[PDB]
Amino acid sequence: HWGYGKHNGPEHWHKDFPIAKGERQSPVDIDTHTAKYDPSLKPLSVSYDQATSLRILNNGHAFNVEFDDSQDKAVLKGGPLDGTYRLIQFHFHWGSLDGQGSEHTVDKKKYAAELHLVHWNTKYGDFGKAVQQPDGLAVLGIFLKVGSAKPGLQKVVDVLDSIKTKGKSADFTNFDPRGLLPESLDYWTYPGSLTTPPLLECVTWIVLKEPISVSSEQVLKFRKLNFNGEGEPEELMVDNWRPAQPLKNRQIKASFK
Ligand SMILES: [Zn+2]
Numbered sequence: 001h002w003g004y005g006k007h008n009g010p011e012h013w014h015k016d017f018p019i020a021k022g023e024r025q026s027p028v029d030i031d032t033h034t035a036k037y038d039p040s041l042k043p044l045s046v047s048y049d050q051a052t053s054l055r056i057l058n059n060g061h062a063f064n065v066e067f068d069d070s071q072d073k074a075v076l077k078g079g080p081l082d083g084t085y086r087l088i089q090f091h092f093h094w095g096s097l098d099g100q101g102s103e104h105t106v107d108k109k110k111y112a113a114e115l116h117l118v119h120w121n122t123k124y125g126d127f128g129k130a131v132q133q134p135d136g137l138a139v140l141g142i143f144l145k146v147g148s149a150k151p152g153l154q155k156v157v158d159v160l161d162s163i164k165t166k167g168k169s170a171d172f173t174n175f176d177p178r179g180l181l182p183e184s185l186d187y188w189t190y191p192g193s194l195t196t197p198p199l200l201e202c203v204t205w206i207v208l209k210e211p212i213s214v215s216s217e218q219v220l221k222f223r224k225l226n227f228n229g230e231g232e233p234e235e236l237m238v239d240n241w242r243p244a245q246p247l248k249n250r251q252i253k254a255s256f257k
Contacts, residue, residue, distance in 0.1 A: 002016065002017075002196075002197050003060075003061065003227065004061070004227075004239055004240050004241075005227075005235070010242045010243060013197055013199065016197065017197045017198055017199050019193075019198070019199050019200070019201065020199050022193070022199070022201055023201070023248050023249065024191055024192050024193055024201040024248070024250065025192065025193045025199065025201070025245035025246070026103070026104075026192030026193040026194070026195050026203065026205060026242075026245060027102075027103035027104040027105070027192070027195055027242060027243075027244055027245065028104065028190065028192065028244055028245060028246075028247050028250075028252070029104070029105045029106075029107075029108055029244045029247075030104060030105065030106050030107070030188050030207065030252055031107060031252070032106060032107055033107075034252070035188055035251075035252040035253065035254045036251070036253060036254065037253075037254045037255075037256065037257045038253040038254065038255070041079060041080060041189070041253065041255045042078045042079060042080075043078055043079070043185070043255075044076075044078050044079040044185045044187060044206065044255070045076070045077040045078035045079075046076060046140070046178075046181065046185065047074065047075045047076070047077070048074045048087070048176070048177050048178050049178075050073040050074065051067060051073055051074035051087065051175075051176065051177055052067060052068040052073055052074075052173075053065055053066070053067055053172050053173055053174065053175040053177075054066050054067065054068060054171075054172065054173060055169055055170065055171060055172050056156070056159055056163055056169060056170050056172040057163070057168075057169040058163040058164070058165060058166055058167065058168050058169070058225065058226075058237075059166070059167075060166035060167070060227055060228075060229075061196060061227070061240060062091040062092060062093065062237070062240055063091060063092075063160070063163060063225065064089040064090070064091045065089060065090050065091070065156065065172060065175060065177075066088070066089045066172075067087050067088060067089060069086045069087065069088045069120070069127070072084060072086060072122065073086070073087075074086065074087035074177070075087065075119070076117075076119045076138050076140060076206075079187065079189065079206055079255070080189045080204055080206065080253070081138055081204060082135070083121055083122065083123055084121070084122050085119035085120060085121055085122070085137070085138040086119055086120055086122055087117060087118070087119050087177070088118050088119065088120055088127055089118050090115060090116060090117045090118065090177060090180070091115075091116055091118075092113050092114065092115050092116070092144075092222070093113060093114050093116070093195075093240050093241040093242075094112065094113035094114075094144075094219065094222050094223070094238065094239075094240065094241070095110075095112060095113070095238060095239055095241065096223065096236075096238040096239050098112045098146045098216075098219070099112070100112075100239070100241070101113045101114065101144075101239070101241055102114040102143055102144075102241065103141075103195050103241050103242055103243075103244075104141060104143070104205075104207050104244070105244055106143075111143040111144055111145055111211060112144050112145055112146045112214075112219060113143075113144035113214070113219065113222070114141055114142065114143055114144065114241070115141065115142040115143075115144060115180060115212075116139050116140070116141055116195075117139065117140040117141075117142075117177065117180075118137060118139050119137065119138045119139070119140070120136060120137055120138075121133070121135060121136050121137070121138070124136055130202065131194070131200050131202045132200070132202070133202055134191070134201065134202060135202075135204060136202040136203075137194075137202050137203045137204070138203070138204045138206060139203050139204075139205055139206070140206050140208070141205060141206065141207040141208065142180065142181070142182065142207075142208050142211070142212060143207075143208070143211035143212070144211060144212055144213070144214050144219075145211045145212075145213050145214075146213070146214060146215070146216055146219060147213035147214075147215070148213045148215060149213075149214065149215035149217070149218060150179075150180070150212055150213060150214045150215070150218065151179065152176070152178075152179020152180055153179070153180065153214055153218055154218070155175060156175070157218050157221045157222075159172060160221055160222070160224070160225060161224075163225075164224070164225060164226050164230075165226045165228060165229050165230040165232075166226065166227060166228060166229045167229055167230075168230070180212065181208075181212075182208055182210035182211065182212050183210060184208070184209065184210045185208065185255075186208065186209045186210065186254075186255055186256040187206050187207060187208050187209060187254075187255045187256075188205075188206075188207045188209065188252050188253065188254055188255070189204065189205060189206050189207070189252070189253050189255070190205050190250050190251065190252045190253070191203070191204060191205070191250060192205050192250075195241075195242045196242070209256065222237075223236060223237070223238050224236070225237035
């Protein structure tokens with residue numbers, strides 16, 4: 001019964017998921033004064049022109065926008081990656097207040113939210129086999145700050161009322177994830193983990209330097225979602241982030257000077 005509440009939050013996850021105290025856990029703090037430029041990194045290739053979104057689901061921890069991943073339609077390549085990684089879903093983590101909500105931090109700065117675009121390595125055939133491999137997933141992480149509205153986010157905002165409670169889903173076709181990207185694709189990269197149970201150490205993280213801006217009204221609608229199911233006492237879906245974990249024997253590399 002893991003979650004983000006008073007008695008089941010991140011500090012308790014290790015009792016059911018001992019890898020929570022592992023060597024390659026995520027998120028981490030990104031220290032911009034020790035991350036080193038790596039000239040061997042190749043430019044990032046984000047290929048989302050043929051993406052096919054299907055559905056949006058409130059899973060009781062966040063909401064997922066799900067894609068058709070049965071063909072190479074929306075893929076991530078280049079950067080630190082070898083091979084081709086297929087987009088399966090995106091989701092967000094956010095706060096109760098604008099000064100918290102991100103999972104990664106930058107020189108200890110917390111952003112209001114963080115977007116995760118989750119991709120799996122096609123050499124492993126399916127997502128469930130990929131998560132068992134150290135190079136199975138690639139997650140593109142994008143910070144959100146509160147300021148101007150993000151036009152490309154509004155179709156997500158407007159469907160949230162239909163998926164207020166745990167277990168609800170809605171059709172969500174023809175959504176273009178390119179409208180969630182910042183101008184620059186400059187990034188930091190390091191090896192890590194899923195940030196929710198089962199916390200598997202299968203992810204190459206690619207965290208963009210440039211945040212996107214969303215409006216106060218857009219974030220306020222995120223904060224009206226519920227962790228609970230229909231007909232249960234209301235528990236607002238806020239503060240669904242894991243804090244920074246020890247870097248241990250890892251280096252964060254920068255794509256940019
Ligand atoms: Zn996430």
